[PDB]
Structures are given as structure tokens and as C-alpha cells.
Ligand binder design. Structure first.
Ligand SMILES: C=CCn1nc(-c2ccc(O)cc2O)c2cccc(C(F)(F)F)c21
Ligand SMILES: C=CCn1nc(-c2ccc(O)cc2O)c2cccc(C(F)(F)F)c21
Ligand SMILES: C=CCn1nc(-c2ccc(O)cc2O)c2cccc(C(F)(F)F)c21
Ligand SMILES: C=CCn1nc(-c2ccc(O)cc2O)c2cccc(C(F)(F)F)c21
Lengths: 221, 233
């Protein structure tokens, strides 16, 4: 109940400090990417616990948010890394792959990376977007208790704080009020496409995923 | 359409609104799995024709090439149906108003296997809109955004980047949404917060759409050709 008292700058600083490291691929291709994703997942948990307001929530709810968001988070991280490598996805510094190397998903990832490039997405805006995804992707599916409804409001209030943060970053960058609301919209609409990609990828898997207990156990430590 | 005032944008959108259709009459009740699917499938099909008329009247849409218009529709058609359903169902807590003569609750959708999830998700969204007091002029803006956004990234060449115009119009709709919020007397802070809240919901509407498609291929979606033919008129 005090991430609600943070300012835009403190919010950013906290998020920038919580950033996971860029991990390397250990050296088929599914093995390297699965292993990479697995090691990344462990850092994602500690990153989450450092997102302002996340630990204010019950364990059950923390797990659910991650359960619904973990894939979208890996994906937006990938897209951010690959921003300055047109036509290539930088899974790891030692694992840069082009188109020809689930092509649908690969193409959508490139498309999103190009979009971030065009917009000149800033690192400070990136960490904000990643936070939004965490708090948003599972908020509409929590369920009758006063506590549950107590969580929802809290999450919504934190998301408001992040919106305030994003706007502030744009004002500081010298954007007009009109340019501010426009860029906010452009950024948030991209999240819909990231959601879409996560869903597509998720059905390819069905065609051992982080289950509910796998995460709940990992959060304990 | 980049010359319209926010007021003129709202008016044009409101005028484009499709009519509410009825589920075909005197179906055998209670329902069977295949009876339900038939009624809803038939409804969606008849609604698709009107959605296209609506799209043609969305400012900026006609400026695109036929091919691009079909692509946006192929991607967004289901999301557009769903946001319409959620809007209709707003003042019916715990129920979904697929049609004025077809008001179903949680347990009347248990007919189909797995579609209960989607039912719950649709109900949750409707509650959210209700809680936010989503206004009509905001709804039409959100729907237009879905149309122009859902397929904008999954379209190179010079002519192609000029079409990606779409982002200008989306900016225009954002301006309109904000203007609507300023009129109502919201503070700047409140304005950007509400704008964010609305757009984040689109992410969830996308999700519900994807779950739908998932079960569709799990049990004859509007084809490219079909959508093109109906566009030509
Ligand atoms: C282009 C998506 C493939 N991909 N990406 C990833 C992936 C891994 C880590 C990461 O940070 C981002 C990713 O997209 C991945 C992980 C396991 C398996 C797969 C594959 F689809 F190939 F089976 C993974
Ligand atoms: C479900 C999609 C494939 N996949 N699997 C995984 C995956 C990674 C680790 C793990 O322990 C289990 C997984 O299914 C994955 C991770 C990131 C990105 C992707 C994707 F391919 F979708 F882009 C991943
Ligand atoms: C959530 C109910 C399922 N549903 N909804 C719809 C649907 C139809 C029209 C509309 O405006 C909104 C809808 O959710 C639908 C259409 C065809 C088939 C189905 C079914 F799942 F049963 F197979 C449909
Ligand atoms: C039955 C699969 C899902 N579906 N299919 C359809 C659908 C509608 C018309 C048509 O010609 C074919 C369809 O699969 C549909 C329409 C509205 C809502 C839904 C959904 F269930 F996802 F909510 C629809």
C-alpha cells in the first residue's frame, strides 16, 4: 500500500533496478530455447517480486498473474532485445536467428520488433510495459471473497500509477499533451498483439509448461 | 477523414452503428449442443453482412485497398462481435444478450463443452464495462480501434508502408476518445488513466477471441473470398 505513494521517477528507478540479466544460450534448437526460457523463468520470478505492489497481493493471486503472463513477458523481452537487429531475433547474444533459420510466430515477433524500432521505444517505457503485462494479463480471471475484490482494486490502482509513470516519461521527453495520449495508446495497443502471439504460441505447445504449482513453489523461495 | 473534428468523428461513428438482430424464431427449447451452435452461428452470419456496412462507414477504412480491408475484417470480425455482445449485455448482470429474444445465463451455456470458459470471460468483461460506466460514444470508438488495430501488424514495399494511414486514423480515434473524456469533465490525469483502462480491455477481448477460434478448429470461419465479395457492393 505504498507503491501507490511512489512518484514516476521512483517507479522507473525501481523497475530499472529489478531488470533481469540478459542470459546466454548454453553452447536441438528447441533444447537451447527451452533451456534458455527455463533459466529466464527463475529471474522473472524475482523480477516480479520487485514490481511495485506485486508483493502486496496474496500468494495465490501472485501465482495466477505469472501463470497468465510468463509467456508474454518472455516474448516482449525478446522483442526488446531484437529491436536493433532488423530481420533477426536475438534470443541470446550468442543466438541470433533470422527468418530462414512455427514461422508464423517468428514473423509476428519480428513485426513487433520493427514497430518498437519505428516508435523508438525507450528502456524506461519498456520496463513499464512489462509491468503492465504482469498485472493485467490475469486480472479479469480471479473469486467472491472480499479479499479477491480487494486485490482487483489494488491491481487497478497500481496500473493507474504506471499509466501516470508512462505519461510523465513522455512529458519529460518533451512531448505535447496530444503526443502523450497518442503514444500511450500506441504502446497499449501493441500489448493486444503480444497477447495474440502468446495465445498462438500456447496452442503450438498443445499441438513441461509452468503449471500452477510449479510457479507457486518457485515463488516461495 | 483526417479532417474531421472529434465531434464529427463521434457523429459519423454513431450513425454507422449496426442494428441489433434477433436469433431466428421458435427454436426447440430446451437446447441441444448442436441446436445452440446453430442459432448462434446463424446469428453471427447475418450480423457479418451488417458489420461490413458498418466498416465501410468507419472514417479512413474506405481509403485502404480492398485487400487490406478484407485483412482487417478477417482478423477483427470475431472481436467485433464479442464487444457488441458485451455492450448489449451490460445492463443484464449474469446474462449475455446475444439477441433480444435470446438472453442466456451461465447455466444455459453449459450445453456446449468448454464454451463455458468463454461465457464466463464474456460476463466478466461486461461487468467491467458496467463498473467503468462505459459510454456509448466510447464504445463505438473502441470498436473502431479493434477494426483498425487487430490486423495492422500482420499485413513490405512503399505502397504497404503508406497504408500502415492506419496509424494516423487510430491517433484520430484516440484524440476523439480523449475529447469525449474532457467534455465530460475528467481531469487530465483521469483522462489518461481511463484511456489506459479502456485499451487494456481490448487485450482481454483479443484473448477471448483467440480462445473462440481455438474451439472453432476444435469441433467454417468467414473466408477471405467471402469477405471480399461482401465488400464489393
Ligand atoms: C520463435 C519461438 C520459438 N521459441 N521461442 C522461445 C523463446 C525462448 C526464450 C525467450 O526468452 C523467448 C522466446 O521466444 C522458445 C522457447 C522454447 C521453445 C521454443 C520453440 F518454439 F521453438 F519451440 C521457443
Ligand atoms: C508455447 C510456445 C513455445 N514455447 N514453449 C516454451 C516453453 C519454454 C520453457 C518451458 O519450460 C516450457 C515451454 O513450453 C516457450 C517459451 C518462450 C516462447 C515460446 C514460444 F515458442 F511460444 F514462443 C515457448
Ligand atoms: C459464447 C457462445 C458461443 N458463441 N457465441 C457466438 C456469438 C455469436 C454472435 C455474436 O454476436 C456473439 C457471439 O458470441 C457464437 C456464434 C456461433 C457459435 C457459437 C458457439 F460457440 F456456440 F459455437 C457462438
Ligand atoms: C464455435 C466457435 C467459436 N465461434 N465460431 C463462430 C462462428 C460464427 C459464424 C460462422 O460462420 C462460423 C463460426 O465459427 C463464432 C461466432 C461468435 C462467437 C464465437 C465464439 F464461440 F468464439 F464466441 C464463434
Amino acid at each position: 500500500s505504498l507503491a501507490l505513494s511512489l512518484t514516476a521517477d521512483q517507479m522507473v528507478s525501481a523497475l530499472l533496478d529489478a531488470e533481469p540479466p540478459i542470459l546466454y544460450s548454453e553452447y536441438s534448437m528447441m533444447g537451447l530455447l527451452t533451456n534458455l526460457a527455463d533459466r529466464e523463468l527463475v529471474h522473472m520470478i524475482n523480477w516480479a517480486k520487485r514490481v511495485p505492489g506485486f508483493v502486496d497481493l496474496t500468494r495465490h493471486d501472485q501465482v495466477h498473474l505469472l501463470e497468465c503472463a510468463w509467456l508474454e513477458i518472455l516474448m516482449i523481452g525478446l522483442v526488446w532485445r531484437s529491436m536493433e537487429h532488423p530481420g533477426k531475433l536475438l534470443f541470446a547474444p550468442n543466438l541470433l536467428l533470422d527468418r530462414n533459420q512455427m514461422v508464423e510466430i517468428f514473423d509476428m515477433l519480428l513485426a513487433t520488433s520493427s514497430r518498437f524500432r519505428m516508435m523508438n521505444l525507450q528502456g524506461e517505457e519498456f520496463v513499464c510495459l512489462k509491468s503492465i503485462i504482469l498485472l493485467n494479463s490475469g486480472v479479469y480471471t480471479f473469486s467472491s471473497t472480499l479479499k479477491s475484490l480487494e486485490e482487483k482494486d489494488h491491481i487497478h490502482r497500481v496500473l493507474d500509477k504506471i499509466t501516470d509513470t508512462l505519461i510523465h516519461l513522455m512529458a519529460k521527453a518533451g512531448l505535447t499533451l496530444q503526443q502523450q495520449h497518442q503514444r500511450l495508446a500506441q504502446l497499449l495497443l501493441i500489448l493486444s498483439h503480444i497477447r495474440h502471439m502468446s495465445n498462438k504460441g500456447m496452442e503450438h505447445l498443445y499441438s513441461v509448461v509452468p503449471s500452477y504449482d510449479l510457479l507457486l513453489e518457485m515463488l516461495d523461495a
